[PDB]
Design a protein around this ligand. Structure first.
Ligand SMILES: [Zn+2]
Lengths: 1075, 53, 49, 40
C-alpha cells in the first residue's frame, strides 16, 4: 500500500547522515548499495507436504521370534550318574538350554541387530511368571485388579497383539559376511558372522548340527540323526569381481512364520522397483524436452528404489485428500498461492502497465468538454504493478475446479445498477466482459449477459422467469444453473425491434465465447494417474491451445482471446452509436469514444498470444511435480444441461446395503469452496503484456525449468500413498474380525470370547490400530483419521459429481491387496494351531478334586476325568439358576436348566458369565463342597491365559491354596490367570508322594513343552518329551527338499533364509541432469 | 495421427439475419466447429483416443 | 399395565448400525436435512446472496 | 437427575466440532454453542 514512515530511526552509516525513520533508512542504504496450530494448520501442512514413511530397513541378526528358555534347572550333580557323563562338566556349550524342563516362548526380534527399530514388540515372560498384562491393554480400562483381565476382550487384545507381531517384523534380511570352518566339525562350511559385541555365543545357536556327539543324552541323540551337509551358505550370486555378492541362501536357525512374513515384504518391495533408465525417461517426458537427464550404461550393482505404484492407490489417496479439503477455503488457498509463485518464477511474460498509458495519451479530444473517456478508463483501470497475482491465481485455479471455483468479486460490479448513459458503468461493463472468460465459474456467461441487462433498464426490456430475479436484480446473484433466464436460452424472446443491442450481445456470447481444450501432461509409466474423472494424462483448459511455430515470438492478432476483445469493442461501438441511449452527448464526444474504443481493440499486448501458446505448456510442465495433483471436471462451454452442480465423496455405507454403486447416492458429502478475484487486476494483466527484448523460448525454459526437476521430492509421496492404502485395508480386515461388515473376510479366531461391539468399541479399536501403525513407519501427521470420524465398520471409498440433468458420474476405485493384512491373516491362521506358544489355552477347565500319586500333567489329563454336554448324568445350568436353602438337615438344592433341582454333588456345567454374575453368592455355597465333598464343575470359557507351578513329586503337595485364590477373585468384569500344578521330570527313579489337583484342562494344551531332562539319557518319572523332530523337518528328513515349509500347523524353527546386499541410494545420486 | 482443423463448408453475407426463411448453416460457417484426426488404421485412432478427451 | 410413549420402541442391542434409517428419529433427521437441501439447491429463495 | 445417573448415554458436544472442522459451518457452530454443557 501507500505506506509512509514516522519518527524513530536515524543512522545512515555510509555517509554520516540522520534520516526520518528506519524505513527511510533502509530504502536509503538500499539505494547506496544499488547505485555505486489448529487442525486447519495441520491439514494445510499435510497437503503441502506429508511425512514419508520408513519402507526399507535392514536386519543383521538371525530372523526369528521364538526362543527357548529353561524353566527348571537340571540335576547335574546327582548320586546315580557321575558328573563326568554330562557335557556341562566339560564346558561344552550346546545349542539348546540344558535344563530339566525347557519350553518355547515368544520374544519378537530377540536375536536381531536392526537398523531402525519399529517400537512394536510382543515380549513374553516364561509361563512360570505372569503374562496377564499382554491381554488387558485395549478396552480393559476399568478392571480394578492389577493381575486381572476381562474375558470379553481377549479377541480384540489378541488381534492387536498379532498386528504388533507383524509390524515388528517388517525388516529386510541383511548380508553380513562369512568365514570358513577350520575345524573338522563340518566339511569346510561357510559360517555367517553376525555383528555385535559378544559374537562367540551365536555360532552354537545358529548351527545346531556342529556340536560333537559324545553322549547318549537327548541333545546328542538328536544331533546324531541330522543331515551333515545342510549348514551355512550353499548358494550365492557373485555378479561382480570382489563386490559383495548380491544375495545368498544360508541354512540357520529361524522360524517359518517370520521368514514368510519377511519374504512377503520383500516380494511387495520388489514390485515397486524402478531403474535409472525408466526414471530418466519419465523425467524427460514430464519436462517435455526442455530438461535432459542422463543415466549410466554399465553392469549395475542391484540398486533397490521402490517408487512405482498402481493407479488405484493414487486414486484412493486423491479421494482422501479431497475429503480432507472439502468446504474450507483456507486449506486449499496456499496451494494456489505457491503455484502462482512458481508461475512467476518460470513464466517469461511480464506485465508492464505503461502500454495502456502510452496508448491512451495519444487520444485526440477537446478541452472545452466535461467528459473524457481516456481519463475515465485510466481512473477505472488504474494500471499499477502492485498485485497482478490475481492473474496467476486465476491461471492456477484451472487445475482445480472440482474443489475450487474462482468467481469475480461483487466489488467489481457497477454498485446497484449502472446505466448505459454513465461512462463509468460503460467501462465497468468492458472490464467485466474481458475478465469473466478467465474464471472457472460455470455461470460467467450469464453473469456477463445480465451485467449488460441490468446496466440498460428503461432503455430495453426482456421477459424474466419470475418477479424475484427481475431484470433490475443485481447481476452477481445469477450464480446457479437454475437461475439462467429463459430468454437467454430461447433467443427469439429478445426481439430486435425492442432489444436490438441486447439480442446482439446474446448472439455474441453464444457464438464467440472461448472454447475448452487440453494439453496432455505427465507420464503414467513410473507415476500413476491421480485424476478421477478425466482420462489419464489429460489436462483440461478453459481456452483453446495450439502450439507455437517459432521460438522467437513476435506479435500477432490471430487468436481467440483477441477476437473476443474485438467483438466486445465492436458491440460497445454499436452501443455508443445511437442517440437513443445517450441523448445528451455531442458529436465530439461520440467521435472521441469511437477513437478510444477503436484504439483499445488493437492494443499491442502479448498476453492473449501467451495464453494461447505458452501458458498451457507451463502448466503441463509444472503439474507432474505438484504435491497435490490436479482435480478437474469438464468445462462445459455454454450448455446449461451439463453444468456440474455438485461433487461429493462417501466414506461409509448407509444401511443393509453392501454395494457402493447403490449406497453412494445418499451417503456423500459435497466438496467445494469459491474464491473471489479482481476483474480490474485480471483485465489490466490481460491488456498489458510484453516479452523480454529478444527471448528465445527454448533457452529460457531450458534454464528456468532445471531446478524444479533437479529437486526430487515427488518420488517420496508415492510411498506415502502406498502406506495410506495399506492402512485402510488393514483397518477393514481387522474390524471385520470383531464386527459384522460387508466384505468377504476370513475368520479364524471365533473361538476366543468377545463382547458385542458397538460404534464406540469399533471406533476405539480403529484408533488403536491407527496409532500402532503410525508408531511403526515413523509417522507424525494424520493417517486413517479422515475415516475415523464416522462408523468404521461400514467403510467404503467413492466419489462422484452430478450435472444439471441429474445424470451422475461415479468413480469406485478398486481396492488392491495389502501385504500387511495378508500377513496378519497368516499370523492368525498360524495362531489357530500354535496358540499355546503365545500363552493361550483352548477349551475349558474342570474344577474338582483328584488325589493320587500319579504324574500325569494337568495340561494333558487322562480321558476318564473330563465330561461334556452329551454325557449321562450331567446337569447343565444357566438360564434361571436359583438356590434353595436346606432345612432340618435336608441338603440345599440348585435349579437345573430344565426346571429340576439337585443337591450339591456330581458333574455340573457352568457358563463363566453365570459364575461371574454371582461370584460371591456361589463361593460361599459351593467352595466347601468342592474342597472336601464330591462336587465337580466344568466352567466353560473357550480361551484363557494360564500360569504354571512346578513341584517336587516326592513331597506332599496340595493345590487348594492356588485354586481358591482364583475362584474367590473371579469377578463380574475380570478373571486372573488359571494356575496349574505341573510335576518335575526325573531322569532316575524316585519315590512317590500324594498330590491333590483341583484344576485340569479338557484338551491337550501342553504344546510349548520343548524337552524334558535334555541332558540326561532318559526321563523315567514325569512328562517326558524328546526334541520335536517335526519342528526340524529339513534337517532330519533327508528326502524333504531344503525349501519346504509346513506353515499352518508347524513353525519349523530352522530352515533356509535368503539374505540381500542391495543398496538404496537417492535418485539424484544415479540420475544426473545436464546443466 | 494427423490433426487438421475443418473449416467453413458455408459462408455468411450481410443480409443474412437469422430469418425464418434463411437457409440453416449448421454451425459450419464459423472458424472452428470440429477437429479431424486422420490416420491409416482405426486401431491406431482408437488407441489415440485413450489419452484424449 | 401400560406406559404410553410418544415414540416407537424396539428390543435392545448395542450391535446395531449408527446410520439406520429404519429408526424413526434418524429417519426424521435425514428427511429434515434433505428438505433443507432442496430449499437451498437452486437459490430460488435466497436472492441477495 | 435419576435418569442422568442410571443411563449409559454420554453427551459430549465435541463430536459436532470434530465433524465440522458467511461460513455456514461456523454459523451453525456458533448457533449450537457446543461449549455449553447444560443438558437438563
Ligand atoms: Zn547516505
Amino acid at each position: 500500500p501507500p505506506t509512509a514512515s514516522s519518527g524513530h530511526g536515524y543512522q545512515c552509516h555510509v555517509c554520516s547522515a540522520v534520516l526520518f525513520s528506519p524505513l527511510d533508512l533502509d530504502a536509503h542504504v538500499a539505494s547506496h548499495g544499488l547505485h555505486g496450530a489448529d487442525v486447519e494448520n495441520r491439514k494445510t501442512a499435510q497437503l503441502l507436504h506429508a511425512d514419508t514413511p520408513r519402507l526399507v530397513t535392514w536386519d543383521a541378526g538371525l530372523c526369528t521370534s521364538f526362543k527357548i528358555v529353561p524353566i527348571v534347572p537340571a540335576q547335574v550333580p546327582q548320586d546315580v550318574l557321575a558328573y563326568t557323563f554330562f557335557t556341562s562338566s566339560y564346558a561344552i556349550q550346546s545349542p539348546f538350554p540344558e535344563a530339566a524342563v525347557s519350553r518355547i516362548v515368544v520374544h519378537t526380534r530377540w536375536a536381531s541387530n536392526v537398523d531402525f527399530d519399529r517400537d512394536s514388540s510382543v515380549i513374553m515372560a516364561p509361563p512360570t511368571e505372569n503374562n496377564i498384562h499382554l491381554f488387558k491393554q485395549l478396552l480393559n480400562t476399568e478392571t480394578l485388579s492389577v493381575r486381572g483381565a476381562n474375558p470379553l476382550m481377549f479377541r480384540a487384545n489378541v488381534l492387536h497383539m498379532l498386528l504388533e507381531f507383524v509390524l515388528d517384523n517388517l525388516y529386510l534380511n541383511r548380508h553380513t559376511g562369512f568365514s570358513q570352518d577350520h575345524t573338522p566339525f563340518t566339511e569346510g562350511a561357510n559360517l555367517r558372522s553376525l555383528p555385535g559385541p559378544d559374537a562367540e555365543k551365536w555360532y552354537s545357536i545358529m548351527y545346531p548340527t556342529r556340536m560333537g556327539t559324545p553322549n547318549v543324552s537327548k541333545i546328542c541323540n538328536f544331533v546324531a540323526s541330522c543331515v551333515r551337509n545342510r549348514v551355512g551358505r550353499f548358494d550365492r550370486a557373485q555378479m561382480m569381481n570382489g563386490a559383495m555378492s548380491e544375495w545368498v541362501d544360508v541354512f540357520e536357525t529361524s522360524d517359518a512364520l517370520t521368514v514368510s512374513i519377511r519374504g512377503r515384504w520383500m516380494a511387495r518391495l520388489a514390485r515397486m522397483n524402478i531403474n535409472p533408465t525408466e526414471i530418466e525417461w519419465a523425467l524427460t517426458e514430464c519436462a517435455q524436452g526442455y530438461v535432459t537427464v542422463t543415466s549410466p550404461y554399465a553392469p549395475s550393482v542391484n540398486r533397490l528404489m521402490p517408487y512405482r505404484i498402481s493407479n488405484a492407490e493414487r486414486q484412493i489417496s486423491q479421494i482422501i485428500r479431497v475429503m480432507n479439503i472439502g468446504n474450507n477455503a483456507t486449506v486449499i488457498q496456499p496451494v494456489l498461492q505457491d503455484i502462482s509463485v512458481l508461475l512467476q518464477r518460470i513464466s517469461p511474460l511480464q506485465i508492464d502497465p505503461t502500454i495502456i498509458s502510452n496508448t491512451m495519451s495519444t487520444v485526440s479530444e477537446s478541452t472545452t468538454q466535461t467528459l473524457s473517456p481516456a481519463s475515465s478508463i485510466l481512473g477505472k483501470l488504474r494500471p499499477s504493478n502492485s498485485d497482478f497475482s490475481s492473474f496467476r491465481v486465476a491461471l492456477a485455479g484451472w487445475l482445480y475446479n472440482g474443489v475450487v471455483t474462482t468467481v469475480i468479486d461483487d466489488s467489481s460490479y457497477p454498485k446497484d445498477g449502472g446505466s448505459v448513459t454513465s461512462l463509468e458503468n460503460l467501462w465497468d461493463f468492458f472490464i467485466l466482459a474481458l475478465a469473466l472468460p478467465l474464471t472457472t465459474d460455470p455461470c460467467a456467461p450469464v453473469k456477463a449477459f445480465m451485467t449488460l441487462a441490468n446496466m440498460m433498464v428503461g432503455f430495453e426490456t426482456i421477459p424474466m422467469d419470475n418477479q424475484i430475479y427481475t431484470q433490475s436484480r443485481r447481476a452477481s446473484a445469477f450464480s446457479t444453473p437454475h437461475t439462467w433466464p429463459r430468454c437467454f436460452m430461447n433467443i427469439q424472446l429478445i426481439s430486435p425491434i425492442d432489444a436490438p443491442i441486447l439480442r446482439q450481445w446474446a448472439e455474441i456470447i453464444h457464438r464467440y465465447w472461448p472454447n475448452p481444450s487440453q494439453i496432455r501432461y505427465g507420464t503414467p509409466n513410473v507415476f500413476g494417474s491421480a485424476n478421477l474423472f478425466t482420462p489419464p494424462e489429460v489436462l483440461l483448459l478453459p481456452i483453446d491451445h495450439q502450439p507455437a511455430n517459432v521460438t522467437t515470438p513476435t506479435l500477432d492478432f490471430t487468436n481467440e482471446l483477441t477476437n473476443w476483445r474485438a467483438r466486445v469493442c465492436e458491440l460497445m461501438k454499436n452501443l455508443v452509436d445511437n442517440q437513443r441511449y445517450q441523448p445528451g452527448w455531442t458529436q465530439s464526444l461520440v467521435s472521441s469514444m469511437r477513437g478510444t474504443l477503436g484504439k483499445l481493440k488493437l492494443i499491442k499486448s502479448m498476453t492473449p498470444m501467451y495464453l494461447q501458446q505458452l501458458a498451457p505448456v507451463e502448466l503441463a510442465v509444472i503439474a507432474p511435480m505438484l504435491p497435490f495433483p490436479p482435480f478437474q471436471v469438464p468445462y462445459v462451454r455454454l450448455d446449461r444441461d451439463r453444468v456440474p452442480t455438485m461433487v461429493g465423496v462417501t466414506r461409509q455405507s448407509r444401511d443393509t446395503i453392501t454395494q457402493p454403486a447403490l449406497s453412494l447416492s445418499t451417503t456423500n458429502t459435497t466438496v467445494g469452496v469459491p474464491l473471489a478475484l479482481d476483474a480490474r487486476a485480471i483485465t489490466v494483466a490481460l491488456l498489458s503484456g510484453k516479452y523480454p527484448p529478444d527471448l528465445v523460448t527454448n533457452v529460457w525454459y531450458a534454464d528456468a525449468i532445471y531446478p524444479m526437476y533437479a529437486d526430487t521430492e515427488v518420488f517420496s509421496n508415492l510411498q506415502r500413498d502406498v502406506i495410506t492404502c495399506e492402512a485402510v485395508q488393514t483397518l477393514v480386515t481387522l474390524v471385520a474380525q470383531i464386527s459384522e461388515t460387508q466384505y468377504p473376510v476370513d475368520r479364524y479366531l471365533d473361538w476366543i470370547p468377545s463382547l458385542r461391539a458397538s460404534a464406540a468399541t469399533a471406533a476405539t479399536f480403529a484408533e488403536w490400530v491407527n496409532t500402532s501403525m503410525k508408531t511403526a513407519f515413523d509417522l507424525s501427521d494424520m493417517l486413517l483419521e479422515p475415516l475415523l470420524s464416522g462408523d468404521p465398520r461400514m467403510t467404503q471409498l467413492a466419489i462422484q459429481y452430478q450435472q444439471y440433468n441429474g445424470r451422475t458420474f461415479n468413480v469406485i476405485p478398486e481396492m488392491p491387496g495389502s501385504v500387511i493384512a495378508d500377513c496378519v491373516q497368516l499370523t492368525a491362521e498360524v495362531f489357530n494351531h500354535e496358540y499355546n506358544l503365545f500363552g493361550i489355552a483352548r477349551g475349558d477347565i474342570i474344577i474338582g478334586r483328584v488325589q493320587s500319586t500319579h504324574l500325569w500333567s494337568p495340561l494333558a489329563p487322562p480321558p476318564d476325568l473330563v465330561f461334556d454336554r452329551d454325557t449321562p448324568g450331567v446337569h447343565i445350568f444357566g438360564r434361571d439358576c436359583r438356590i434353595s436353602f436346606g432345612m432340618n438337615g435336608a441338603a440345599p438344592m440348585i435349579r437345573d436348566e430344565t426346571g429340576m433341582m439337585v443337591p450339591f454333588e456330581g458333574n455340573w456345567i457352568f457358563p463363566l458369565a453365570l459364575w461371574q454374575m454371582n461370584t460371591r453368592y456361589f463361593n460361599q455355597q459351593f467352595d466347601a463342597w468342592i474342597k472336601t465333598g464330591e462336587l465337580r464343575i466344568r466352567i466353560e470359557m473357550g480361551a484363557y491365559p494360564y500360569m504354571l507351578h512346578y513341584y517336587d513329586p516326592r513331597q506332599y503337595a496340595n493345590a487348594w491354596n492356588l485354586t481358591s485364590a482364583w475362584l474367590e477373585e473371579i469377578t463380574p468384569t475380570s478373571i486372573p490367570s488359571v494356575p496349574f500344578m505341573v510335576p518335575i521330570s526325573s531322569d532316575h527313579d524316585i519315590s512317590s508322594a500324594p498330590a491333590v489337583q483341583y484344576i485340569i484342562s479338557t484338551e491337550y494344551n501342553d504344546r510349548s513343552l520343548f524337552c524334558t531332562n535334555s541332558s540326561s539319557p532318559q526321563t523315567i518319572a514325569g512328562p517326558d518329551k524328546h526334541i520335536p523332530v517335526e519342528r526340524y523337518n529339513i534337517l532330519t528328513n533327508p528326502d524333504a527338499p531344503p525349501t519346504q515349509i509346513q506353515l499352518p500347523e508347524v513353525v519349523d524353527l530352522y530352515n533356509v533364509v535368503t539374505r540381500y546386499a542391495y543398496e538404496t541410494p537417492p535418485i539424484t545420486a544415479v540420475v544426473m541432469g545436464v546443466p | 495421427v494427423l490433426e487438421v482443423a475443418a473449416g467453413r463448408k458455408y459462408l455468411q453475407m450481410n443480409n443474412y439475419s437469422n430469418d425464418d426463411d434463411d437457409p440453416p448453416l449448421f454451425a459450419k460457417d464459423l472458424s472452428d466447429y470440429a477437429k479431424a484426426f486422420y490416420s491409416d488404421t482405426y486401431e491406431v485412432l482408437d488407441r489415440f483416443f485413450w489419452t484424449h478427451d
